[PDB]
């Protein structure tokens, strides 16, 4: 069943957890681009390509978390309309749909999205028995392109003064 105060509390918890995960994962990217530069200085290149695939996935994850933080803050702003109306607003449909979409995709790191999506499905069970395309691309379980990887290596080599040769 839908409880409004539970949904408000869990949206604030999602905001706080996503802020902490953004800070922590940007610091982990700082830590790991140095070891990608260490692999490039040691000479192993395909190893550095796979580590770059890891860090590209982490950066897409950070941008996905700031998109979801934007949408949860939008629900905290329009929570009066949520608690008042019974029909889903057009300004809320994108946010509610992509949070219900992204909550199984981010079940591990943010455990309050499961509760937020359960409350939103209980609120709009009449509609759900839309989703942001850029957010779906950032949550997509798909390998990044090789030119993006090579380009990523180029700027790592430029920052850490390591000679690297692309394809």
């Amino acid at each position: 069943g839908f409880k409004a105060e539970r949904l408000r509390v869990n949206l604030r918890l999602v905001i706080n957890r996503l802020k902490l995960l953004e800070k922590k994962k940007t610091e982990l990217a700082q830590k790991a681009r140095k070891e990608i530069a260490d692999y490039l200085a040691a000479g192993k290149d395909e190893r550095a390509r796979i580590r770059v695939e890891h860090i590209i996935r982490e950066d897409y994850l950070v941008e996905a978390m700031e998109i979801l933080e934007l949408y949860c803050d939008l629900l905290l702003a329009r929570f009066g309309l949520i608690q008042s109306m019974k029909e889903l607003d057009s300004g809320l449909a994108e946010s509610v749909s992509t949070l219900i979409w992204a909550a199984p995709r981010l079940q591990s790191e943010v455990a309050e999205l499961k509760i937020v999506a359960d409350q939103l499905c209980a609120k709009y069970s009449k509609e759900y028995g839309t989703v942001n395309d850029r957010l779906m691309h950032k949550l997509s379980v798909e390998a990044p392109p090789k030119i993006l990887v090579e380009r990523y290596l180029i700027e790592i080599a430029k920052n850490y003064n390591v000679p690297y040769e692309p394809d």
Binding site: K23, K24, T26, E27, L28, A29, Q30, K31, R33, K34, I56, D59, Y60, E63, P145, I147, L148, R151, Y152, E155, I156, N159
Partner: protein, 77 residues
């Protein structure tokens, strides 16, 4: 008595087991220290440690941005 209750084959097996268990223990302490670093990443930024080493090496006379570029390049493709 001691050389029949502990043969050279038993010494060889015991020493191989000794060496392999310390290999597994070194893997254990490696992933332990990996978690102990990842938990407290926010108190050790990498840039501050780098600039602090550069400062205190230039004081002794040894002599040993990117996020925006990579973000714009992810925006490109």
């Amino acid at each position: 008595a001691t050389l029949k209750t502990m043969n050279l084959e038993k010494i060889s097996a015991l020493m191989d087991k000794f060496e392999h268990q310390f290999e597994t223990l070194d893997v254990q302490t490696q992933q332990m220290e990996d978690t102990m670093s990842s938990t407290t990443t926010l108190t050790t930024p990498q840039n501050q440690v780098d600039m602090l080493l550069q400062e205190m090496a230039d004081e002794a006379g040894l002599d040993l941005e990117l996020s925006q570029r990579l973000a714009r390049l992810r925006d490109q493709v």
